Design a binder for this molecule. Structure first.
Ligand SMILES: COc1ccccc1CN1C[C@@H](C(N)=O)CCC1=O
Ligand SMILES: [Zn+2]
Length: 139
């Protein structure tokens, strides 16, 4: 679990969105595994606007943060789960590291701010859904 809070927005993994997230929907994209809902409270996370390929992510299945190198956002084939059939997920970044389904929502950060959230894993890889291209999150 986990979310990003910036301004009047809440960014979560689309497959973990609640009834309240869907009742206050701002934007969602199944191909990216992202959903953004509106909030009444003001959030103060900072979104990165950069092309970093190194950062640190939080792994709840180890209660640890890990430094990683990751690929630039791209279209990657993701095996089926109970939430999606096998498909290409867009705007995904991969790194070598540990990830279990419950790790989804853990933040990946660089020196400029939040880069994305855990969205995929297995076979010793971890995948992060990018948010750096969503410029409207700041306004
Ligand atoms: C071993 O599978 C994983 C490991 C870490 C994280 C996630 C998974 C598998 N997964 C993929 C998600 C997606 N983005 O398509 C949907 C929910 C889910 O359980
Ligand atoms: Zn950066």
């Amino acid at each position: 679990s986990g979310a990003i809070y910036v301004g009047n927005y809440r960014v979560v993994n689309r497959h973990l969105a609640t009834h309240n997230d869907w009742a206050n929907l701002v934007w969602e994209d199944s191909s990216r595994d992202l959903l953004v809902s509106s909030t009444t409270a003001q959030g103060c996370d900072t979104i990165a606007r950069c092309d970093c390929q190194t950062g640190v992510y939080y792994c709840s299945s180890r209660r640890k943060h890990y430094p990683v190198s990751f690929s630039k956002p791209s279209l990657i084939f993701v095996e089926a789960s109970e939430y999606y059939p096998a498909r290409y997920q867009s705007h995904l970044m991969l790194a070598v590291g540990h990830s279990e389904p419950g790790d989804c929502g853990g933040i990946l950060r660089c020196q400029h701010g939040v880069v994305g959230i855990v969205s995929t894993g297995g076979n010793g890889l971890v995948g992060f859904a990018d948010v750096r291209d969503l410029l409207w999150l700041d306004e």
